[PDB]
Write a protein that binds this ligand. Sequence first.
Ligand SMILES: [Cl-]
Ligand SMILES: [Cl-]
Ligand SMILES: [Cl-]
Ligand SMILES: [Cl-]
Lengths: 120, 120, 120, 120
Amino acid sequence: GITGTWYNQLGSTFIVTAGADGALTGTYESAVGNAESRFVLTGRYDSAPATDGSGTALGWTVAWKNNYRNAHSATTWSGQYVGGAEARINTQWLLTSGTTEANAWKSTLVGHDTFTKVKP
Amino acid sequence: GITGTWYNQLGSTFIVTAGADGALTGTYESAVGNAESRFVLTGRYDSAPATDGSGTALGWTVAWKNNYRNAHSATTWSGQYVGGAEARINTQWLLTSGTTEANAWKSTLVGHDTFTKVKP
Amino acid sequence: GITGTWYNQLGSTFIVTAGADGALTGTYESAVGNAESRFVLTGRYDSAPATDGSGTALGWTVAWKNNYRNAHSATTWSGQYVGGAEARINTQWLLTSGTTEANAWKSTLVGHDTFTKVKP
Amino acid sequence: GITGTWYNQLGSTFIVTAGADGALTGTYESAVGNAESRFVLTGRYDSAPATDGSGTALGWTVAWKNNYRNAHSATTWSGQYVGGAEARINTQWLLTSGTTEANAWKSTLVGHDTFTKVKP
Ligand SMILES: [Cl-]
Ligand SMILES: [Cl-]
Ligand SMILES: [Cl-]
Ligand SMILES: [Cl-]
């Protein structure tokens, strides 16, 4: 249920393959339709989730370096997949930039993204 | 500078290899000296960081499933590596458990870890 | 624009007064229509926000103790008010429980709430 | 045990009064010894905590507006007080700036502070 394409509510999209034993691998495109905005992502998921209706825990990282861009930063998304009609991956994220020590206190942004199988 | 073993301040340790083009791969052991507490981790880092003194952005995920344990949960660490004498990886983390929809609001813990090359 | 009643998307509601010089005071009801679920809240807001279209920064705390309940915990909401038609207070929150030292690492939940002037 | 002066590990300090029924009121000084860096804070704490060794949950907000400064932003600290020799208030914080809608995704920084009764 995880393998495939997902869209957040703001114009990003990623493509992921969920390996049989817990690997996540794919590509994150921060601006739909812009190939210069595609970055590697890698992560993990629970490959034997509960069968009681609960979601499937997962996480992934994108370091914002590709051939076109280096933001000197990385985002991690932590969340759960919820299957069915209206499947979704509900996440909260942390975006850390490399900083000097004086600026470390402002290194890390927090937010949330809801991913769906259809565009907003 | 990232490749190798790191210890948080509370008794965990991980081992990571930083690939030339941004891959992080390794193992996270949640309780030092307990092999049943070793889990796969995967992530990304900025493989061309700034040279102005700033840290190197990175992130990784551990899904808490191995042959001995399934917590139906995953932690992502987001942070930066700071090299030199007293090298450290300073992070903030998100731990999401798979939940029912009614319990989703309590799915995700937040915290921080400081990793060093020597044990606390 | 802040003074008044707000509803999150999940069944809570609060009532706030925004004082002229930055005070927030009011009541948070975690379950709409249940008076046993009303708790004091107090906080602050920027009483001279930018006039360029940007939101108004604010935050508040509820300690989850009233005459009916003590969860030994407190939530802080940090966010911004955005006025107009479809006014909203967009927030992220931290819920810390009192814990033993051994359990401190799991003391704090994170999430988000969007408040509107009309019920979901 | 909460009433009094506390210092984070980076050069801030605040002064708080813990009211008998859960109020926190005081002043936060972001740069020790600089009176232009003093801002109102208000919050809540659990005024009947557990007696089993667990910490006392609390939170507070500072909106970063005073007579000298307006950063158009507010920080909330969520945490717990732990008494005894080496008393501490262990916190995680969210700092939200007022932003345009386009920039909302980058509105909120996250971090942590440990407060002690003695300066670092
Ligand atoms: Cl796999
Ligand atoms: Cl690589
Ligand atoms: Cl006021
Ligand atoms: Cl009081």
